[PDB]
């Protein structure tokens, strides 16, 4: 029901999140950006290379315990 996801930043640091399978991943994006002190819209969050939308859930994306989310600067 809850899984732990590892969010890896551009500098190789990690913040882990415990989320429900039904959680909207906007909440992870907002929390991560808050902790980094950057605007949420300055970042893109990828799972298996694909962009995570605000309304995506772990269940929708097939995420599993200890899966990795990568954070990159938004494209320009």
């Amino acid at each position: 029901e809850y899984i732990k996801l590892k969010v890896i930043g551009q500098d190789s640091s990690e913040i882990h999140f415990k989320v429900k399978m039904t959680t909207h991943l906007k909440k992870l994006k907002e929390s991560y950006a808050q902790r980094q002190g950057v605007p949420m819209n300055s970042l893109r969050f990828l799972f298996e290379g694909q962009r995570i939308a605000d309304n995506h859930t772990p269940k929708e994306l097939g995420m599993e315990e200890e899966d990795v989310i990568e954070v990159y600067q938004e494209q320009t």
Partner: peptide, 9 residues
């Protein structure tokens, strides 16, 4: 860095 785990929802 120390381990950091944040619970959501």
């Amino acid at each position: 860095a120390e381990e950091r785990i944040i619970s959501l929802d």
